Design a protein around this ligand. Sequence first.
Ligand code: CA
Ligand code: CA
Ligand code: CA
Ligand code: CA
Ligand code: CA
Ligand code: CA
Ligand code: CA
Ligand code: CA
Ligand code: K
Ligand code: K
Length: 335
Amino acid sequence: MNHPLFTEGTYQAEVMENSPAGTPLTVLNGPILALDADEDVYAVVTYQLLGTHSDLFVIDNSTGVVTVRSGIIIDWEAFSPPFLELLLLAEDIGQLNGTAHLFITILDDNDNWPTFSPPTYTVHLLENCPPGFSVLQVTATDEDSGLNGELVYRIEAGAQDRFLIHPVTGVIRVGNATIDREEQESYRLTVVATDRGTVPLSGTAIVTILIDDINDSRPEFLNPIQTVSVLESAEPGTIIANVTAIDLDLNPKLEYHIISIVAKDDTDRLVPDQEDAFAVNINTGSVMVKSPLNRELVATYEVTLSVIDNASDLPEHSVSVPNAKLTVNILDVND
Ligand SMILES: [Ca+2]
Ligand SMILES: [Ca+2]
Ligand SMILES: [Ca+2]
Ligand SMILES: [Ca+2]
Ligand SMILES: [Ca+2]
Ligand SMILES: [Ca+2]
Ligand SMILES: [Ca+2]
Ligand SMILES: [Ca+2]
Ligand SMILES: [K+]
Ligand SMILES: [K+]
């Protein structure tokens, strides 16, 4: 009986993780207080603090106030559950000790950054993929609790509405935009996940999106219109011109052809059966005299040349639009 008595059986208390040394515990139920049992004499009562995690704290042995110790760090993420049990002793010399318990709840602080692991990504994607196609999912982790761990995803740069991301799931999908390998063959997306604590932290990942090829882009002649004067004395074999085209797809097989050769004499009049006159090299586009030329037979030739990508996956983007045009004015030879 004659031992000192605390005001409470158990003092309920709390403290914020990462509090610096000196920080008193918030003690929900009054101050930690014991008094000597003898109502006639006076007797000094000192306080002690014991238990497996008492090393995190120091008790003011005179006032009984519990503060955070120097050296140590209170880590919410290091205790499951986030709840300590400590014994308090009241000492009066020549008396048995007082007993109370100090139960302490460690409070969470937003002190973990939303982390991506892996912290970067690479994905291949086929061009002409329709709106809303699901490209990649990205997940970040957070060792905080409650809202301080609840993450919200968002594309910061590299995107321009061509890719969108679900704020919750982190699923990157294609936006309402044409993904054309020829217009842009790759993307480097900066993607941030932000926590919802009041001081909100964020962390970053980099999604490379390599656009794969469909052979879907027609060859283009770089020299579409061309007039050339050739001597009627030009022998067969003689290169007089070269049409040249480019397909912007990944592995084209270009083939140059002559679609027609219209011929006209010097009185501006149709001369038929003169397709033997010229020939285009099927790979290079080099145009040569093929048969003997005579001005007195043919004065002008209009020649149309096409080019096909034989590898093209789409049939309506196979051929040159427009075809190449080559007028060939024939020069006179005389005495
Ligand atoms: Ca912590
Ligand atoms: Ca925390
Ligand atoms: Ca956080
Ligand atoms: Ca394309
Ligand atoms: Ca293509
Ligand atoms: Ca093509
Ligand atoms: Ca002649
Ligand atoms: Ca002549
Ligand atoms: K007393
Ligand atoms: K005493």
